[PDB]
């Protein structure tokens, strides 16, 4: 773990980065559906 080590850090870095962009795309389909029914909770709860 002293030798290679840091690829586990960037594996922990990219996946936490990937959960962030996963929510932002989920909130983006709540944004294009915000012109349809309600502001957030219509497209959120149906897609939750």
């Amino acid at each position: 773990v002293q030798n290679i080590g840091g690829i586990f850090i960037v594996l922990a870095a990219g996946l936490v980065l990937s959960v962030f962009v996963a929510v932002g795309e989920f909130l983006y389909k709540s944004k294009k559906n915000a012109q349809l029914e309600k502001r957030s909770f219509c497209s959120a709860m149906v897609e939750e």
Binding site: V1, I4, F8, L11, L15
Partner: protein, 48 residues
């Protein structure tokens, strides 16, 4: 003395060091046994 019937030389008698063989699970050696777990917990983690 007569002429020699054999030619000498002073040297050192000592044991051969025992060449312990690289046993048949030799390919696991280039990574530490906790790193093979850390890779296994990665592919069980990142897949989840």
């Amino acid at each position: 003395f007569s002429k020699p019937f054999m030619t000498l030389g002073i040297s050192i008698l000592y044991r051969k060091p025992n060449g312990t063989n690289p046993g048949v699970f030799s390919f696991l050696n280039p990574l530490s046994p906790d790193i093979w777990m850390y890779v296994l917990l990665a592919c069980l983690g990142v897949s989840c």
